[PDB]
Design a protein around this ligand. Structure first.
Ligand SMILES: [Mg+2]
Ligand SMILES: [Zn+2]
Ligand SMILES: [Zn+2]
Ligand SMILES: [Zn+2]
Lengths: 34, 67, 256, 98, 98, 44, 477, 528, 115
RNA sequence: AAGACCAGGCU
């Protein structure tokens, strides 16, 4: 089950998913929306 | 913006190779093989096609002000 | 005491490229020849530009800058044309300029690539050298109309008048004169002109030697053939020396 | 006009009580480069006065790890007082403890 | 109608919300533009995050010349409703009596 | 005078005292055609 | 913690902290708390497994994303004062294993150590090979690097807009530039940089530039200036009318002649405008007229790019004019790499006078070697080597900060396979005499930025000009 | 109020009487020009066209002034104004006015600033009186002020976006004052520390050392070029040191022609060991490392910062004291020009191979670091089992910190010494450090071996979290890694924690630089 | 503003003499040649040709300032020979060498283009 | 006009 030293691909994939969902300015938009 | 006509260092014309480079890369050549196929030997001409960013495509999305 | 007797070997000769070796001549001779290859060879390039309509996304002097860098076939009439500073006329004529006209409209939906093929000249010898060289891309409804005059100049004025796409120059491929000092000779790749074995790094030091073969590789940008670039450079350097001899004959005659 | 004035001038409070208010908020967005625009949109300001010669609040604290960029601050009287946000840092928006 | 509230670009109440690349290009808006700024009188204004001390939590400090050896304080606010920024201090006077 | 509209991209005929609305679409932004007088550039 | 990880009745934004020694348990739902995501570690094993990575690699057309990753209890948001109770592992493959047993109670693991940097510091190649003041200097100077700031700039009417002719993405890139969109809007050019003392004009922090390259469009740019003006028709206005003044009819009059103006008193676009030229002819009808016409900034020497006529808030006639000028890099202009090495242009030499390799390559930029030893920017040298490797290989080099899979020996071994000296040195020939240079000069492609500061915007001279009203002293500015 | 008008800075007294805005002043960016003299400054034509100097008409210069008046303000050199005996100020810039262009003795013609004019030149932080020296105008293209590089260290200026002010005296008397008092060659030696202020800096110093080594043999054409770049040369080619196999000159032999007059000086090179003076070879130094100049000939020795730099008893200082200001100027200019033009042949560079050391040296450095870390572990274990005895006058914490700092400093010093010993004679880092041009032995050590301990307010990295530095470390960890000791070098790259600790270390320096300036300036003003 | 026009690298104006000859008073039989609007291309050539003359004692050139387009050549010869004669002879020898090189290069081109 | 705030640059 564990990631067998493929880690460089894995961590940048999850970082790409994070930045694809949120972006860079969510603190502005979330604050104003709330 | 758009591919420069001349390589800045030596002066070789790279303005007519952007479309061919794109075609080869679409035809499954890697960047190194495509640059060799186009005839760009020394690193100064290779960096031109390797590091170019084509913003003119993005600029052509906007409608003109002309009729 | 007396002048050189140099000799030329030519190894490779194509439409792009000329590899030749000059033997038995001075280093300063060779350096000035390779320097004249760049900066003193006359060629034809677009210099005056007037734009009538430009609704593209690139601005007027952007397009004018690209137009000047487009090589023009200069093979024949560059000896026949005058410099504009030499010429007797106050405005542009066939003895001192070539007229180019561009007229492109994008009526169709798909993007049109304006290339050097769309440049139309008044005379058949001096077409653009040339896929073709891309000047600008046009969306539907965009238009580009302009006139251009091409003049005669050389590399000192502007890099658009450079007839050449890099000159390779090399002498003493095996470091026998020790003009360069390798801290570790074993780490340096051997030149394609090296004449020594795979096992030894450098030729033995030659205290009596002087630089003696110059290896050349002149690569043309398309305006002039690489064979005629060298001939034009030699003729121009000889003409410069003859002009000094002439005017220095007058300066001695003043000193007399 | 209250919202418009306080967002235009930058003085944060009543215009008649501008002596009592806070200033420096709502600067003109920097459009020199895309990186400049992003850095300006992700930026933090310490309210501690700029004349303060006390070094302590300016120093890079251990607790900034992963939250605030260690490299990026202006040079001058505002060293360490203007801080930029890390790439993965997220500021909580708040919720009710019901 | 009681007034007009400026709208942060690309927020849930902006007209650019949920639009695609084609729509943004038709509107002469760059898709790469992140938003997160306001437009007031034609200029673009960006609110800078303002750092401040936390509220409702007890803190204990000391400062060298004060009459107190230790000063406990609690900057308190009622859920950011009706906020007075009321601060109590609870201090210990110095030992140095004579 | 003629100005081009900032949305429908048509020409509109207009004079110096006229308020700005486009005759085809009501839109309030106009652009002045590049003039007819010629400007010479060097290709340097 | 179970409920927070299951998102059941506790939002992931809520932080929970147990201080064991003081017997307190604190829960914060408050706004304004800063936090960052972390991977959960159970025992010695990550909760992130290969199926999560497979689904995230097939993220497209699967509606599986970072929110689904959070909902699975794999990643957790942690704020500042909860980190006090957290045992963090820098990387899983290194710190989870049975090395010599420093710790075994790891509870969290960083996604990647390079996520501690900001937006401007994430563009630096090899930032761990540089001095921290130089990293700070680069972070500050990157905001002033010129490029294409926004794609629709031809629509925008902004004052002081700078745009570059031929931006290039760096040949040596950071893994985080993809999320900063630096490929789409680059702010510089890759240039062949030789680190050598050539003629003494690059001493101190100066730079020698290639004039032949500059003539080919190297670091050429455009500067746009916008001008606002209006009829002001409200209140004590009379009217302030756009019209072309006649030569001596108005009161205010100057040696600036109005004849570039059109019928409505507005210069049409495409007209060359120089110093003192009147862009907008506006006359006051004054209780008999005053010229309030606007002029260009002195010596701006530009061309009218766009003219716009609208109606403002009030509903009176309001006009914007945008002027452009091209500005070719000169001696006084400021250039900088991505490492804090900033410098003006000491002198420009043509291609004939520049030193050249055996292949005819001449450097675009020559920088003094004396900038390196004291400033200790080794990342500059490593970038220069990596770019030389990449330009030959056809790939784009990876300069992400803390990756052990890149080192200088490996880069040298890769470069040695392409027929070059493995440390980047190369034999140069003197441009003036053609003789070889005794030393071998370090050369290679490096990413360089043109800065907003130019000498044409800074040069100033004074002799008996304007006088201040109150002090009768020379003006300020 | 009136009190507020007069009270503070920018108030009337300080802001308009003690200092004020002036006319005939120019500002622009400064760029280097090694082809200028040490008293010359390059001035753009636009600034020289704007700036004017009033000149009085007399029978000597009336023809030249009439030619300037007919050139007018359009062509570059002419006049802008003509001032009559009554004070009537005719302006040439708008109209030709051919009846008014007549000149007679007593008029004042305000001509454009020409070559040879005297100007005060200034850089703003203005700390001592060498921050404002009088220069001599030379007119050059483009738009930057140009000055010689030896003049940079008086002004503390570097060519990175720096701007400098230009003041032009408007009267003959004040021109005479600046010429006779504040000219650059008259300010070579400061009264502050009786040392020269200007010295040989950057490329030229490293080239001086490499040129003045023993191995430099110069061929005939190279000698003729270097002599072509001498301004004080008498025109006689010296007889070469080596004659028959081929004629070969030496670098010292040409440097002796640069040295003015008959100067006697004795210095020592930086790499001079103390063993040579004790035993034999006192006067025939094997490393070439003692300097002897007799009768204005450099007999032996390698020049460096200790000989051509700004120090007491330097060659330049002795030259000034013996020969005066006029000859020392030519001495600086000749050194600059001829040695830059020689450096055109040899060249200088820096690269990765200059920063990569030997594989055996790397192993030695790693062994030293491991031994040091083991020693710090054993000291920690001694304190943990309460076996450590407290030093007199010191707390247990104080002595523990002192011992650990001692161990780490010894480790860093030993690794640096090993790295410096591993350097080759061709290494460009060594070539720059030895000559004193730039860089230092600690910079080499940090580049090649070990960055070293990072300190915050002169202490080891504190505990910002409860009992630890970062969440990656365990509580109560006083080991070198946890407290900010950077084991790696810049070439090898730093780990994430070491990178953060180095950022913390540099932040302190930035803060100190930003803060100290106000106090220093306030002290300076109060002293003055 | 102050950018000079592109042509000061190669073109003379009214009043500029292409060559100016000044005698050097420091040393007998020494002369100083000033060539306007030229660069290293010609100075290096002339100096290298002059150094071959056995009757020339000194031969050197320099550019006083790169931003200016000017060459200064100093020639010192032995007592029974004029540096003016040395200069003319060097120029003639250079022209003679270049003509022969051109002819041999043309012959080589013709031999290469067939067989 | 003038005043205010802000941002940036060189030490
Ligand atoms: Mg500086
Ligand atoms: Zn190239
Ligand atoms: Zn004609
Ligand atoms: Zn319309």
């Amino acid at each position: 089950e564990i990631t067998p030293d493929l880690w460089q691909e894995a961590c940048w994939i999850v970082i790409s998913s994070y930045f694809d969902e949120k972006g860079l300015v969510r603190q502005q938009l979330d604050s104003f929306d709330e | 913006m758009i591919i420069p006509v001349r390589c800045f260092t030596c002066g070789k014309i790279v303005g007519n190779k952007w479309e061919a480079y794109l075609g080869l890369l679409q035809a499954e050549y890697t960047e190194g093989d495509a640059l060799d196929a186009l005839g760009l030997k020394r690193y100064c001409c290779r960096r031109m096609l390797l590091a170019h960013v084509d913003l003119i495509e993005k600029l052509l999305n906007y409608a003109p002000l002309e009729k | 005491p007396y002048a050189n007797q140099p000799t030329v070997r030519i190894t490779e000769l194509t439409d792009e490229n000329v590899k030749f070796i000059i033997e038995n001549t001075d280093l300063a001779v060779a350096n000035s020849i390779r320097r004249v290859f760049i900066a003193e060879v006359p060629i034809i390039a677009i210099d005056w530009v007037q734009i009538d309509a430009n609704s593209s996304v690139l601005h007027d002097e952007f397009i004018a800058h690209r137009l000047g860098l487009i090589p023009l076939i200069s093979d024949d009439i560059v000896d026949k044309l005058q410099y504009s500073r030499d010429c007797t006329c106050e405005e542009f004529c066939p003895e001192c300029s070539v007229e180019f006209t561009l007229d492109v409209r994008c009526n169709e939906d798909q993007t049109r690539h304006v290339t050097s093929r769309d440049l139309i000249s008044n005379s058949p010898r001096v077409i653009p050298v040339t896929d073709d060289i891309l000047i600008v891309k046009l969306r539907k409804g965009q238009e580009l109309r302009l006139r251009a005059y091409a003049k005669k100049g050389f590399g000192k004025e502007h890099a658009k008048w450079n007839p050449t796409a890099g000159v390779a120059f090399e002498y003493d491929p095996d470091n026998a004169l020790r003009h360069t000092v390798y801290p570790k000779p074993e780490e340096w790749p051997k030149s394609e002109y090296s004449e020594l074995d795979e096992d030894e790094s450098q030729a033995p030091y030659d205290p009596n030697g002087k630089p003696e073969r110059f290896y050349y590789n002149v690569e043309s940008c398309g305006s002039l053939r690489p064979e005629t670039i060298v001939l034009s450079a030699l003729s121009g350097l000889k003409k410069k020396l003859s002009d000094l001899q002439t005017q220095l004959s007058h300066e001695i005659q003043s000193d007399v | 006009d209250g919202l418009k004035y306080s967002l235009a001038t930058g003085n944060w409070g009543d215009q008649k009580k501008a002596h009592q208010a806070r200033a420096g908020v709502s600067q003109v967005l920097n459009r020199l480069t895309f990186a400049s625009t992003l850095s300006h949109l992700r930026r933090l300001n310490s309210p501690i006065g700029r004349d303060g010669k006390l070094a302590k609040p300016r120093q890079l604290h251990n607790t900034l790890w992963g939250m605030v960029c260690p490299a990026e601050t202006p040079e001058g009287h505002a060293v360490g007082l203007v801080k930029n946000l890390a790439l993965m840092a997220y500021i909580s928006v708040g919720s009710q403890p019901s | 109608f009681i007034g007009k509230i400026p709208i942060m670009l690309r927020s849930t109440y902006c007209l650019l919300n949920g639009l695609t690349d084609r729509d943004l290009c038709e509107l002469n808006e760059c898709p790469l533009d992140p938003g997160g700024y306001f437009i007031i009188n034609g200029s673009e204004k960006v609110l800078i995050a303002q750092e401040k001390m936390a509220t409702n939590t007890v803190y204990v400090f000391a400062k060298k010349d004060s009459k107190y050896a230790y000063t406990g304080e609690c900057r308190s606010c009622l859920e950011n409703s009706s906020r007075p920024t009321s601060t109590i201090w609870v201090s210990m006077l110095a030992r140095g009596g004579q | 005078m003629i100005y081009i509209c900032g949305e429908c991209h048509t020409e509109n005929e207009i004079k110096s005292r006229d308020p700005i609305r486009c005759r085809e679409c009501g839109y309030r932004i106009m652009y002045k055609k590049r003039t007819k007088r010629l400007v010479v550039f060097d290709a340097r | 913690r179970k409920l927070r990880r299951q998102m059941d009745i506790i939002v992931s934004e809520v932080s929970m902290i147990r201080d064991i020694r003081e017997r307190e348990i604190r829960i914060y739902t408050d706004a304004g708390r800063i936090c960052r995501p972390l991977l959960i570690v159970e025992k010695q094993k990550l909760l992130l497994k290969k199926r999560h990575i497979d689904q995230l690699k097939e993220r497209e057309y699967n509606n599986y994303s970072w929110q689904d990753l959070v909902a699975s209890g794999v990643v957790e948001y942690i704020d500042t004062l909860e980190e006090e109770t957290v045992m963090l592992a820098m990387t899983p493959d290194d710190l989870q294993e049975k090395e010599v047993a420093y710790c075994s109670t790891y509870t969290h693991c960083e996604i990647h150590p390079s996520m501690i940097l900001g937006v401007c510091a994430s563009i630096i190649p090899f930032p761990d090979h540089n001095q921290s003041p130089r990293n700070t200097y680069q972070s500050a100077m990157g905001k002033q690097a010129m490029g294409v700031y926004i794609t629709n700039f031809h629509v925008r009417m902004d004052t002081l807009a700078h745009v570059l002719y031929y931006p290039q993405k760096p040949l040596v890139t950071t893994r985080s530039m993809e999320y900063l969109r630096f490929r789409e809007l680059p702010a510089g050019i890759n240039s062949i940089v030789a680190i050598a003392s050539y003629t003494g004009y690059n001493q101190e922090d100066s730079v020698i530039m290639n004039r032949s390259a500059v003539d080919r469009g190297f670091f050429r740019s455009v500067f746009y200036r916008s001008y606002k003006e209006q009829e002001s028709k409200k209140g004590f206005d009379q009217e302030e009318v756009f019209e072309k003044p006649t030569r001596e009819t108005c009161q205010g009059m100057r040696h600036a002649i109005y004849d570039k103006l059109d019928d409505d008193g507005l210069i049409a676009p495409g007209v060359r405008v120089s110093g003192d030229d009147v862009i907008i002819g506006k006359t006051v009808t004054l209780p008999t007229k005053r010229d309030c016409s606007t002029f260009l900034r002195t010596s701006e020497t530009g061309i009218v790019d766009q003219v716009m006529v609208t109606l403002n808030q009030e509903g009176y006639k309001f006009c914007k004019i945008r002027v452009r000028s091209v500005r070719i890099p000169q001696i006084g202009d400021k250039f900088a790499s991505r490492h804090g090495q900033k410098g003006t242009c000491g002198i420009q030499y043509r291609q004939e006078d520049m030193p050249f390799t055996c292949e005819g390559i001449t450097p675009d930029i020559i920088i003094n070697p004396h900038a390196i030893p004291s400033r200790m920017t080794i990342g500059h040298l490593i970038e220069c080597l990596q770019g030389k490797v990449s330009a030959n290989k056809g790939e784009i080099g990876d300069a992400t900060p803390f990756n052990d899979a890149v080192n200088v020996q490996k880069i040298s071994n890769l470069l040695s396979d392409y027929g070059y000296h493995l440390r980047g040195n190369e034999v140069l020939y003197n441009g003036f005499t053609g003789r070889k240079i005794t030393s071998q000069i370090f050369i290679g492609p490096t990413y360089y930025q043109r800065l907003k500061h130019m000498v044409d915007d800074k040069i100033h001279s004074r002799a008996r000009g304007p006088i201040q009203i109150l002090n009768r002293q020379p003006m300020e500015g | 109020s009136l009190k507020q008008r007069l009270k503070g800075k920018e108030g009337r007294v300080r802001g308009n009487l003690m200092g004020k805005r002036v006319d005939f002043s120019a500002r622009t960016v400064i760029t280097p020009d090694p082809n200028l003299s040490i008293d010359q400054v390059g001035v753009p034509r636009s600034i020289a066209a704007n700036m004017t100097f009033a000149e009085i008409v007399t029978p000597f210069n009336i023809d030249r002034l009439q030619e300037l008046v007919r050139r007018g303000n359009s062509q570059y050199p002419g006049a802008k104004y003509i001032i009559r005996d009554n004070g009537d100020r005719i302006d040439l810039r708008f109209h030709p006015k051919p009846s008014d262009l007549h000149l007679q003795t007593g008029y004042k013609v305000e001509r454009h600033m020409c070559d040879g004019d005297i100007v005060i030149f200034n850089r703003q932080p203005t700390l001592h009186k060498m921050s404002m020296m009088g220069h001599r105008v030379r007119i050059l293209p483009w738009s930057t002020f140009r000055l010689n590089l030896s003049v940079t260290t008086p002004y503390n200026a570097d060519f990175d976006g720096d701007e400098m002010n230009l003041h032009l005296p408007q009267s003959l008397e004040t021109r005479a004052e600046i010429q006779e008092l504040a000219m650059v060659p008259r300010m070579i030696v400061t009264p502050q520390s009786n040392r020269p202020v200007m010295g040989i800096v950057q490329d030229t110093l490293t080239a001086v050392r490499k040129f003045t080594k023993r191995d430099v043999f110069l061929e005939r054409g190279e000698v003729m070029n270097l002599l072509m770049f001498l301004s004080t040369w008498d025109g006689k080619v010296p007889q070469p040191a080596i004659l028959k196999p081929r004629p070969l000159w030496t670098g010292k032999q040409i440097f002796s022609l640069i040295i003015p007059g008959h100067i006697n000086c004795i210095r020592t090179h930086s790499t001079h060991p103390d063993d040579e003076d004790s035993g034999p070879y006192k006067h025939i130094s094997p490393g070439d490392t003692k300097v002897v100049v007799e009768n204005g000939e450099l007999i032996m020795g390698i020049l460096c910062k200790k000989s051509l730099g700004t120090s007491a008893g330097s060659l330049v200082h002795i030259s000034y004291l013996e020969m005066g200001h006029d000859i020392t100027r030519l001495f600086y200019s000749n050194i600059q020009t001829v040695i830059n033009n020689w450096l055109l042949i040899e060249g200088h560079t820096i690269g990765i191979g200059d920063s990569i050391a030997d594989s055996k040296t790397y192993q030695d450095i790693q062994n030293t670091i491991k031994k040091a870390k083991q020693d710090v572990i054993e000291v920690i274990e001694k304190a943990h089992n309460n076996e450590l005895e407290p030093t007199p006058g010191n707390t247990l914490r104080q002595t523990f910190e002192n011992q650990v700092n001692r161990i780490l400093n010894d480790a860093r010093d030993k690794t640096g010494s090993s790295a410096q010993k591993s350097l080759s004679e061709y290494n460009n880092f060594k070539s720059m450090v030895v000559s004193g041009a730039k860089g230092s032995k600690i910079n080499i050590s940090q580049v090649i071996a070990v960055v070293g301990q990072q300190n915050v307010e002169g202490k080891r990295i504190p505990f910002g979290f409860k009992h630890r530095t970062l969440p990656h470390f365990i509580k109560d960890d006083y080991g070198p890694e946890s407290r900010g000791f950077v084991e790696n070098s810049y070439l090898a790259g730093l780990t994430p924690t070491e990178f953060f600790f180095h950022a913390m270390g540099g932040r302190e320096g930035l803060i100190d630089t930003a803060v100290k300036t106000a106090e220093t300036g306030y002290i300076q003003r109060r002293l003055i | 503003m102050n950018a000079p026009p592109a042509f000061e690298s190669f073109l003379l104006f009214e009043g500029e003499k292409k060559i100016t000859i000044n005698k050097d008073t420091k040393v007998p039989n020494a002369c100083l040649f000033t060539i306007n609007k030229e660069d290293h291309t010609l100075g290096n050539i002339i100096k290298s040709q002059l150094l071959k003359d056995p009757q020339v004692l000194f031969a050197g050139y320099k550019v006083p300032h790169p931003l200016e387009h000017k060459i200064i050549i100093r020639v010192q010869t032995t007592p029974d020979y004029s540096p003016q004669e040395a200069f003319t002879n060097a120029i003639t020898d250079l022209i003679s060498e270049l003509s022969l090189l051109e002819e041999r290069f043309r012959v080589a081109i013709k031999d290469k283009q067939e067989g």
